[PDB]
């Protein structure tokens with residue numbers, strides 16, 4: 001079996017729009033993503049998701065709700081990424097551009113799927129329907145899915 005590392009992903013989803021972050025330079029520049037990163041020792045996953053949202057975007061919320069869990073496997077990497085996915089309840093602050101990331105709102109009829117991780121095309125729609133999910137995606141590099149599962153669940 002494999003070991004897994006914990007990550008978070010937060011979708012700042014409002015009734016008509018979603019806030020995404022564009023990676024500004026390096027490996028995978030121009031890709032839009034939710035906000036998140038690695039869970040740290042001692043914090044709950046939800047608290048880590050809030051912390052990462054703040055560090056990454058400048059936003060605070062005071063509450064998230066869990067919407068899904070997705071495991072990513074990359075060819076050549078033995079460690080799995082176990083990504084815990086949340087959506088915001090309500091938000092405080094304006095988002096801020098950093099050296100790493102530029103935030104932008106997108107209307108929900110303009111979700112930039114071609115410039116997002118390919119898996120997002122599969123699980124976003126569930127997210128938008130306010131449903132919960134478990135997923136797994138195996139990637140060759142950044143663009144090619146070799147195997148995946150996706151299942152709606154009642155409890156994440």
Ligand SMILES: Nc1[nH]c(=O)nc2c1ncn2[C@H]1C[C@H](O)[C@@H](COP(=O)(O)OP(=O)(O)OP(=O)(O)O)O1
Nearest residue numbers: 007008009033034035036037038072083117119120
């Ligand atoms: N296939 C994928 N689909 C997706 O929608 N988000 C993905 C993804 N693969 C990775 N992500 C997200 C998960 C998480 O929010 C982020 C990856 O976290 P990072 O490794 O950048 O974390 P950290 O910034 O904590 O790491 P350090 O570089 O160690 O500081 O990208």
Ligand code: NA
Nearest residue numbers: 037038039052
């Ligand atoms: Na981090």
Ligand code: NA
Nearest residue numbers: 035036037056
């Ligand atoms: Na990050």
